[PDB]
Amino acid sequence: PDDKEFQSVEEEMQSTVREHRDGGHAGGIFNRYNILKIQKVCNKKLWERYTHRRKEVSEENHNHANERMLFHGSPFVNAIIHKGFDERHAYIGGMFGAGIYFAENSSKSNQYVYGIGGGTGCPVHKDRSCYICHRQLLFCRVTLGKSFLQFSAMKMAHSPPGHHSVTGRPSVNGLALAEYVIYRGEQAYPEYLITYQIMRP
Numbered sequence: 001p002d003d004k005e006f007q008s009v010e011e012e013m014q015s016t017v018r019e020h021r022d023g024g025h026a027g028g029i030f031n032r033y034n035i036l037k038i039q040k041v042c043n044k045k046l047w048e049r050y051t052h053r054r055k056e057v058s059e060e061n062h063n064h065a066n067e068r069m070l071f072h073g074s075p076f077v078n079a080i081i082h083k084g085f086d087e088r089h090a091y092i093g094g095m096f097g098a099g100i101y102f103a104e105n106s107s108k109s110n111q112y113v114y115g116i117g118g119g120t121g122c123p124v125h126k127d128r129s130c131y132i133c134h135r136q137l138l139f140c141r142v143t144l145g146k147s148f149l150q151f152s153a154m155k156m157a158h159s160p161p162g163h164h165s166v167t168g169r170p171s172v173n174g175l176a177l178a179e180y181v182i183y184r185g186e187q188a189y190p191e192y193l194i195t196y197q198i199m200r201p
């Protein structure tokens with residue numbers, strides 16, 4: 001795998017960092033990361049499941065898959081790489097109900113690596129702002145198809161009728177940053193596994 005392909009992922013990871021409203025409570029205090037490793041995930045069965053669904057979505061969306069590269073933070077990265085994203089692990093909870101959530105800002109996804117609101121932080125030091133423990137984030141291929149634009153909380157079980165996803169747009173008394181929600185696990189492929197540390201400013 002080319003170093004230039006990985007430089008592009010590294011650049012997306014670094015440039016999409018934003019200052020969070022919680023002052024770093026969930027994901028820690030940092031302006032940049034120390035990127036340790038970028039691995040391309042090659043799971044043929046998951047890739048075929050993804051491309052089969054992408055073709056179905058494109059056909060239902062004027063021959064346009066509306067694919068985006070987006071981040072996903074989770075304590076379950078290893079199960080995701082082996083078994084794929086699974087909506088059965090999603091329960092009504094979160095702004096847009098029982099879906100699989102993605103961010104275009106790496107720092108947003110970083111707030112979910114150790115759990116919701118950062119959980120209790122890293123397993124070894126119980127620190128949400130740990131600068132020592134190595135974190136992992138996924139940089140995913142996500143099929144949005146016809147995405148339903150929403151500003152306020154809308155607890156869905158599935159995509160709205162005629163749609164393939166939900167796009168959560170930033171609003172005054174709502175989201176600070178965008179979020180993208182799918183309700184079918186086969187609509188995302190965990191393309192890159194990023195191993196990194198947040199860096200002390």
Ligand SMILES: Nc1ncnc2c1ncn2[C@@H]1O[C@H](C(=O)N2CCN(CC(=O)Nc3cccc4c3CNC4=O)CC2)[C@@H](O)[C@@H]1O
Pocket residue numbers: 071072073074075076079080083084085086087089090091093094098099100101102103108109110112116179
């Ligand atoms: N194959 C699998 N095996 C085990 N767990 C799996 C799995 N595929 C997905 N999951 C897991 O399911 C969990 C899940 O759906 N949940 C729990 C969390 N909840 C809220 C939410 O996702 N918010 C949210 C908002 C914005 C970005 C991000 C997130 C999460 N990660 C991000 O980057 C929505 C429902 C998630 O923590 C994880 O990805």
Ligand SMILES: [Zn+2]
Pocket residue numbers: 122123124125126127130131132133
């Ligand atoms: Zn730690």
